[PDB]
Design an enzyme around this catalytic site. Structure first.
Site, PDB file in Angstrom:
ATOM      1  N   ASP A   1      -8.703 -16.700   8.030  1.00  0.00           N
ATOM      2  CA  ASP A   1      -9.075 -16.096   6.753  1.00  0.00           C
ATOM      3  C   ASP A   1     -10.141 -15.026   6.975  1.00  0.00           C
ATOM      4  O   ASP A   1     -11.328 -15.348   7.099  1.00  0.00           O
ATOM      5  CB  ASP A   1      -9.588 -17.182   5.820  1.00  0.00           C
TER       6      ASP A   1
ATOM      7  N   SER B   1      -9.221   2.621   0.760  1.00  0.00           N
ATOM      8  CA  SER B   1      -7.927   3.269   0.881  1.00  0.00           C
ATOM      9  C   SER B   1      -7.970   4.632   0.204  1.00  0.00           C
ATOM     10  O   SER B   1      -8.688   4.842  -0.773  1.00  0.00           O
ATOM     11  CB  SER B   1      -6.856   2.392   0.231  1.00  0.00           C
TER      12      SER B   1
END
Length: 330
Positions: A35, A199
């Protein structure tokens, strides 16, 4: 040193991925959920409340000659999906794919929430976010990667998650055969303890690319892709009959639909998520309404590039003094 381990989807939807981890001496192999959005290595154990164990493999520290109770240390965590767990702490030898750390903090669960009990395939979590998020008290502990870093050939790990298939976590090296083209690296902020990046935009299907900054986290422990409501609406508008269902808890779509791809930007590079990766199947057994793999982050407070996004890429988690992320197509 290096390590390399195969990671395997827990079910036919890729709801999560499990990777075998050797703990203790002799080894006890548990299948952990790696994770990158958390920083605790915790396991089901011989100390877990018996009624909260339902098929998981447990760590029994009393059978490990290298286990040592970390005196006074406790842990307690709550995840973004509402699940939680807590317990005490041992140090022990932990190996992943041939890479060994001695003295790793292994957080033994005394209590786990129902969602963990109900998932027999996941024996615990191995956190790969920054150690500043580790919950051990009163002395915070380091992640497996943080402990291994100095010994690795290069201070990196890579995630190569498969679509409906196994993939690979590598530690300490880049497998240049595992991706196409080049790896585009992008800046990371560690201020929230995550692999947080920006992004450069998105496209829906064959549509034009929209240049827009989308701050979010690379999180292998989250199944889906959570993005701003504007982006998500633009995606699902291209799927006839798709709608946001308050009762189901997100966008649903007719199971008969063919889904468009979704592209996200990494610098000037582009990662294409095929439409099929966005199908999470019937909302309940036998339903013709299917759950979408791209959902709004509006109620989260952060955008999350979960497995739906990451499995379309070869992802480098570069833990150099100034961390960065790398993405390549594959």
């Amino acid at each position: 040193s290096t390590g390399s381990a195969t990671t395997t989807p827990i079910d036919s939807l890729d709801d999560a991925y499990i990777t075998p981890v050797q703990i203790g001496t002799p080894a006890q192999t548990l299948n952990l959920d790696f994770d990158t959005g958390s920083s605790d290595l915790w396991v089901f154990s011989s100390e877990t409340t018996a009624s909260e164990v339902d098929g998981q493999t447990i760590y029994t520290p009393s059978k490990s000659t290298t286990a040592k109770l970390l005196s006074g240390a406790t842990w307690s965590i709550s995840y973004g999906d509402g699940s939680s767990s807590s317990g005490d702490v041992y140090t022990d030898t932990v190996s992943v794919g041939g890479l060994t750390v001695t003295g790793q903090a292994v957080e033994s669960a005394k209590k786990v929430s129902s969602s963990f009990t109900e998932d027999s395939t996941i024996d615990g979590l191995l956190g790969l976010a920054f150690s500043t998020l580790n919950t051990v008290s009163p002395t915070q502990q380091k992640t497996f990667f943080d402990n291994a870093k100095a010994s690795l050939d290069s201070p990196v790990f890579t995630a190569d998650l498969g679509y409906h298939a196994p993939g690979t976590y590598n530690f300490g090296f880049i497998d240049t055969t595992a991706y196409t083209g080049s790896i585009t690296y992008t800046a990371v902020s560690t201020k929230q303890g995550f692999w947080e990046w920006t992004s450069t935009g998105y496209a829906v299907g064959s549509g034009t690319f929209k240049s827009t900054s989308i701050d979010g986290i690379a999180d292998t422990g989250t199944t889906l892709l959570y993005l701003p409501a504007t982006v998500v609406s633009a995606y699902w508008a291209q799927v006839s009959g798709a709608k946001s269902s308050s009762s189901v808890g997100g966008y649903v779509f007719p199971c008969s639909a063919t889904l468009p791809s979704f592209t996200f930007g990494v610098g000037s590079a582009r990662i294409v998520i095929p439409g099929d990766y966005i199908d999470f199947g019937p909302i309940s057994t036998g339903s013709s309404s299917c759950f979408g793999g791209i959902q709004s982050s509006a109620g989260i407070g952060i955008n999350i590039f979960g497995d739906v996004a990451l499995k379309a890429a070869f992802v480098v988690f570069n833990g150099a003094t100034t961390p960065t992320l790398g993405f390549a197509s594959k």
